[PDB]
């Protein structure tokens, strides 16, 4: 899994090298950044339910056809609405993992790999998830560097869906 720490090791190991100051510095930056990352992960976790709920409605609001068109891919049935909220939960949870891990690894591994395939196979619009993610970004209530941290991984997901 890609973290500042595993990248540092990977760089050394790729060359058959012991770790050098070159890498220890990278890891130190990770350790220092962790204060902001952890704040963000905690706040997003604590507020996850309202963020997810609010995010789901923001989608339904922007794309109301998703609540009315017939189809297993839509949120026009209770089961469809439940899958949609689950997915949004997934995204949010991955953001928090990225924050804890200090890198994109969890989202890369658990969510982004295969994403286009799954979206295209199950007829899910990336634009739906982007709206959910834009809502979360707008309303997570973080400021300062904790917000910069949350937003970097949220925008990473947005980029992966674009």
């Amino acid at each position: 899994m890609k973290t500042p720490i595993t990248e540092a090791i990977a760089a050394a190991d790729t060359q058959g090298r012991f770790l050098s100051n070159t890498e220890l510095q990278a890891v130190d930056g990770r350790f220092k950044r962790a204060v902001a990352s952890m704040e963000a992960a905690r706040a997003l976790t604590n507020n996850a339910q309202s963020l997810i709920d609010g995010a789901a409605q923001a989608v339904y609001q922007k794309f109301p056809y998703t609540t009315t068109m017939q189809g297993s891919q839509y949120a026009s049935t209770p089961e469809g609405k439940a899958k949609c909220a689950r997915d949004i939960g997934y995204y949010l949870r991955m953001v928090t993992y990225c924050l804890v891990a200090g890198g994109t690894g969890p989202m890369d591994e658990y969510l982004i790999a295969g994403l286009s395939e799954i979206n295209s196979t199950f007829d899910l619009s990336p634009s739906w998830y982007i709206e959910a993610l834009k809502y979360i970004k707008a309303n997570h209530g973080l400021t300062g560097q904790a917000a910069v941290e949350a937003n970097a991984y949220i925008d990473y997901a947005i980029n992966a869906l674009s």
Partner: protein, 172 residues
């Protein structure tokens, strides 16, 4: 490979869960203890050559059969490869110290290693001995009170010792 942070995330994802308040706290302690970890890694790494050479010399002194003709560390090729292996192990142990997790050590160093020595005729028990010597030396260097801000690194030395013991178990 995983570090201690990704390790927790991986366990949490398998459950489909957000991190608990206890896990955040744990991981915040790890971060708070980060400097000490960087010192250990720096110190062991900065002294890698003497740890290995001193441990080799000690090994061959205690087991001269290894460097008698016919011996597994006799000839420069076999000597070089032995020293190399000691270098490799120490290297992956230090990766493990940095990561706070042994997955890199297990995955990339320790797996297949016993079987490899068994196939070559290299006595694993001897390797284990060399690892233990490096361990004792690595820890004395890492935990040296001189030239460093005073504090307790005992937990860390325990962890470090654990990677070395792990490595020695894997080959013995």
């Amino acid at each position: 490979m995983l570090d201690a942070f990704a390790k927790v995330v991986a366990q949490a994802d398998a459950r489909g869960e957000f991190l608990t308040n206890a896990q955040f706290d744990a991981l915040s302690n790890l971060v708070k203890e980060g400097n000490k970890r960087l010192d250990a890694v720096n110190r062991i790494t900065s002294n890698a050559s003497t740890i290995v050479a001193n441990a080799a010399r000690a090994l061959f002194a205690e087991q001269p059969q290894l460097i008698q003709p016919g011996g597994n560390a006799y000839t420069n090729r076999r000597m070089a490869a032995c020293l190399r292996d000691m270098e490799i192990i120490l290297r992956y142990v230090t990766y493990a110290i940095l990561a706070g997790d042994s997955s890199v050590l297990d995955d990339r160093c320790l797996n297949g290693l016993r079987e490899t020595y068994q196939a070559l005729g290299t006595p694993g028990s001897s390797v284990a001995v060399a690892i233990q010597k490096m361990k004792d030396a690595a820890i004395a260097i890492a935990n040296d009170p001189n030239g460093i801000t005073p504090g307790d690194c005992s937990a860390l030395m325990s962890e470090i010792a654990g990677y070395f013991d792990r490595a020695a178990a894997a080959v013995a």
